[PDB]
């Protein structure tokens, strides 16, 4: 009843609605992977790195990088998440003075995008033209990376 195109997925990897789709082979998200011991927020500077799921960190368990508009970052998350960027809620972005690249995500079009955080707070995508995440419609984050 959200009436959206792109599904969100539970912590077992099952879509809450619609058909499942696979992640891009070169995305930083590697599935299958466990998640959901807690909802643990973090910051851009301290995003978890590859390998961190083994030991976790001082904030608690780590499953990977999650992001939603705000921007808000998590190192683990329990609720439904996007496995692909929901391009229905993105639009063309204008120039960004300073960016931080945080991963590589599959788009809802099946294509591979670099994902960034702009200094203005916007979440940006670039293929391999820039798009920005303008609508936090479902308030579900995008699972960017498996740690
Ligand atoms: Zn892992």
Residue numbers in the entry: 17 to 144, 150 to 168
Give verbatim excerpts from the published study on this entry.
Pestiviruses, such as bovine viral diarrhea virus (BVDV) and classical swine fever virus (CSFV) use a virally encoded protein, the N-terminal protease (Npro), to suppress the transcriptional activation of the IFN-α/β genes by interacting with IRF3 and inducing its ubiquitination and proteasome-dependent degradation. The Npro protein is a leader cysteine autoprotease that cleaves itself from the nascent polyprotein during translation of the viral mRNA, freeing itself for innate immune suppression activities. Npro has a unique ‘clam shell’-like protease fold that is distinct from other known proteins including all known proteases. As predicted, Npro consists of two domains, a cysteine protease domain and a zinc-binding domain.
Here, we report the crystal structures of CSFV Npro and a C168A cleavage site Npro mutant to 1.6 Å resolution. The C168A protein was expressed as Npro-Δ17N protein that contains a Cys168 to Ala mutation along with an additional four residues at the C-terminus, 169Ser-Asp-Asp-Gly172, a sequence that corresponds to the first four amino acids of the core protein. This construct was intended to trap a substrate-bound form of Npro; by mutating the cleavage-site residue, Npro should not be able to catalyze self-cleavage at its C-terminus. Unexpectedly, the C168A mutant was active and the SDDG peptide at the C-terminus was cleaved, as confirmed by mass spectrometry (data not shown). Introduction of the Cys168 to Ala mutation resulted in different packing in the crystal lattice. The C168A Npro crystals belong to the spacegroup P212121 with one molecule per asymmetric unit and a solvent content of 54%. In comparison, CSFV Npro structures do not have a disulfide bond between Cys69 and Cys168 because the active site-containing helix is disordered in the wild-type Npro and Cys168 is replaced in the C168A Npro. Since C168A is as active as the wild-type Npro in our hands, disulfide bond formation is not a required step in catalysis. Thus, although Npro does not require Cys at the cleavage site, Cys168 is conserved in pestiviruses, suggesting that the residue may have an additional function other than participating in the protease catalysis.
